[model samples]
Target: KGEELFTGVVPILIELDGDVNGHKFFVRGEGEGDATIGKLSLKFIATTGKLPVPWPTLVTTLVQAFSRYPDHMKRHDFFKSAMPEGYVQERTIYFKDDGTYKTRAEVKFEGDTLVNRIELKGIDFKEDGNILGHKLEYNFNSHKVYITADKQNNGIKANFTIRHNVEDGSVQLADHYQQNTPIGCGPVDLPDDHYLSTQTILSKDLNEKRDHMVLLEYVTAAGITHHHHHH
Candidate 1:
C-alpha cells in the first residue's frame, strides 16, 4: 500500500518545582522508578538493553503549550486569586510507566505569586536514557543549585533562574558561568517577567518546530533538501 503513516508524538510532561529543564535529572539511566525509597536506584541499575524510545521528549513538548499560564501569573496579582486547582508546592519528575523518562518541573507560590521552573529533556537519538548528557538542578527560588549542570560550564548555561515575584533564594546565578557556544537558549521572550533559563541546548527539534530542518539543510547540503521534503 505504501501509505505514509503519521505516528503522532506525545510528550510526557513532568511537573516539578522548576520545569522541564530539570527533567534531565531523572530522564537518563537514572531516576527511573519510585523516588520514595531506594527503589528508583535499583530499577535504574537492573534495567538493561538500549533504553526504550524516550517518551519524555514528547511530554515536554506538550507541557510547553501551558507554560504561558505560569508566565501570565508571574506578572498580575489578579489572576493569582483564582488559584489553579490542585496547585501544590512540590517537585515532580515524570516518566513513562515502562521506566523511560520525560519532563520535570517545580511549582510553588510565594504570597499569591507563582514561581515555576521547567525543563524539556529531549530524546537522545543515539543512545537510550541519556538526555542532554547529564542531569540538572534548581533551587526553591528557581536559581540553579550547585549540583546543577550549569556549574560545569560556568554560569551562562544555567538550567534554571528565579521567578521575579518570589523572594531572593541566594542561589548562584550564571554570573560566574562562562557563555558556552551560542547564547539565549531558554525562554527569554516570555510575555511576562518569568525568569527561566537552562544549560541545555534549545534546539527546535525538541520544541516541535518544523523549521529544525533548516539547520540540517545548511549542515548536510544535499541530504537536508531530501530530508526537508519528507519532514
Candidate 2:
C-alpha cells in the first residue's frame, strides 16, 4: 500500500470564524502541480449563515488560491519573510533544497475577489505528535485550519513558522517521517506500494494550526448581527 498523508480518519474542520462582511478570510491546504487541495468532505462552520457573498464564492476563493498557490509563490519569495533569520539553516534549506508547494494560504478576500494580502505557514510531520498532526488526539482531533487578520487589509501575521522536511530539500527534517526524494513519485510520504494503502499520513490530510480571533468577533459590514451555529 502506498503511504498517504491522511491515513488516520480525521475531519478537516475548516473554521473561518470572523467578519463575514466587507472582507472575508480564507485558508486551505495546497497540493502539488495541477492537483487541487484534496479533502473528503470539507465541513465549514461559521457564526453567520448569511455572508455578504455566497458561501461557494468564499470556498472558490480558497480553492482557487490553493490550486494556483505554486504560481503565486513563484512570483513572490515569501520564504524570506515567513522563515526567521535566526533559523539560519532554514534560509538555505528553503531556497536550495525543497520547494514549498504543499502548504496553505491564509489571506483575506478584499471587496469581491481582490485579495488584500496573504501569509503562508506550515508544520512538520512530527510537530503534533509521533505521527498525528495536532496535540489533541481525542474527539476534537480534527485538524482545525483557521486564521485571523489582526490589522486591516493584512492577512494572518506571525513572527515565524516551521517548514516541512520535504520542502526543506537539503535533508529530511524528521527521521520518524518518510524521506522525500528527488520528486520522482508524488509527495505526502507515499511508500513504495501499488495499492491505495499507507503507513504514513498523506499531504491531503494535513491542516496546519494557527489563525482565528477577529473572525468570531465581527461578521457584519461594520456592526449589526453576529451569526453563529452549533451542532
Candidate 3:
C-alpha cells in the first residue's frame, strides 16, 4: 500500500530529423513510456505536503509525440482532458504544446544522401575541433535528453538525442553534458534553412534512440505487479 499501483501508460513514437555528430542525420525514436497523467486520489494529494512548487497539485506531464498528419498532435493527447489548462509552448527547448514547430516536423527528406552513422563506442571522435575527453560507447540500446556522464550507468554513462527549444525552435541535443556541449557544423546550404545550424531535425525515414525511463511503483492494494517475495 504505497504509491498508486497501475500501468496507465501512454506510448510514444516519433520520427524526426535529428542532428548528430554535427551533421545531417535522421532519428526515429520509439518507446512505450509509463509516465501517464492519472487521476490523483486525496491520499496521493496528501503526499505532496513535503513537495515545494507554487502549484504542486497542478503539475502535469508534457509529452512530445508527433507525426506529419493533422490532429496527430492530439492523438497522444490522452491525459490532458483532466489536466489544468496551463501547458503551452513556454519552457525549455524540449517542452511545449502550442500549435508550434514540435508538431509541424519536416519528416520527408528527398535531397541529400545523409549516411553518416557514427557508432559511439570504444572510440573517440573529433567534435568542434577537440578530441573527445571520455570514450563514448553507444549502446545499440540505453536512452535520454539528459546527459551528464556524471552518474555512472554500469560503466556506460551519459545519453544522446535531439531535443528542440519549444519557443525558439533551436535544437538542444546534449552530449557528454557535464563535459561540453558541441556545436553544429554551420549552415545547411538549403534555400529555406531557417535556423542557424546547417543541420535540421527533419526526418523521412530514420530512427532515434532517445530520452526514456521505466518508472515503476508497487502498491499492495493492486494486483498490477503480481506479489513477489521480497521488497
Candidate 4:
C-alpha cells in the first residue's frame, strides 16, 4: 500500500540586530522541517528604508539558527558570512532564475536603510525583450514595506503595513497602490488617505445594508442583472 509517510521535525527561531552607517537594522526568522516539507519565515527591520537581502536556505537556516549569538553583532558581518568570500558591498551578489527569466540583485546600504535593486536581464520565452528594474525598501520603526517600479519596468508602486496585537488576537493590514501612468489613460490615482479611509473592529462580526435603489435602476436600464450574494 502506498501511504503518506511521517518524517522528522525541526523548529527554530532567531533575532539579531546590528549597527550600520549610524543606524540600526535587525532580522528575525523561524522555521521547521526539511526543504520539501518545511516552513520558513524571515523579517528585516531597519531604521531607514532598506530591503531585506537575505534568502532562506537549508545551509543558511542551519548557520543562523544554531550559530553563537556573540559571533555576529553587526548586520554586515552576519550577511558577509552568508555570502561568498570577497563579495563587496553595493555590488551584484548573485543571479536568480525563474526557469523562464534570469534576474540579479544589487545590495547597498544608504545612511539608514538597506536597498535591494533588482534587474531582469534575460528571458527564454520572448523574442523582443525589454529592460526592467525595481526596488524594495523596509522601515523598522514603522514596520512598513515600500515597493517602487519605474515606467520602464511596470509603472506602479505599492505599500503594505501590518499591525498585530499579541494581547488580543487582532491583526490589521493597510495597503495602497498607485499607477505611474496618466490617470485618464490608465488606472486612476488612489486617494491620499486610502489606508485610513475606513476602520472596523475585529472583535465582533457584523453587516450593513445599503439603499441601492438608484444603482439598481441604472443597472436595470442597462440590461444588467443584479444578483446579491450573502456570506
In order, candidate lDDTs are 0.22, 0.22, 0.20, 0.22
Candidate 3 per-residue lDDT over residues 1-231, each given as its tens digit: 001111354333333332223333233333332323221211011121221111110111112111111121222121122122111121112212211111112111122111111111111223321112112121111223221221121111122333333223333232322111111222111111011111111122224133222222211111122224311
Q: What is candidate 1's lDDT per residue for 1-231, written digit by digit as tens?
A: 000010122112232221233232322211121111111111011022222222223222211111112222322111122222112111222332212223333332333223333443333222332333222121112232111222332211212222221123322221121122112122221121222222112222355322111010000001112232332
TM-score of each: 0.18, 0.22, 0.22, 0.20
Provide C-alpha RMSD values for all models, in order.
Answer: 21.5, 22.2, 22.1, 23.5
Q: Quick one: how many clashes does candidate 4 have?
A: 2
lDDT of 1: 0.22
Worst 10 residues of 1 by lDDT: 214-223
lDDT of 4 by residue, 1-231 (tens): 000111223343333332322333344433332212222222323233441221110011111111111211221122222221111111111212211212233322222222333333222321221101211111111232232333352232434433322223423222222222221222221211111111112111133122100000000001112234310
lDDT of 4 at 193: 17
Model 4: how far residue 216 lies from native, Å: 44
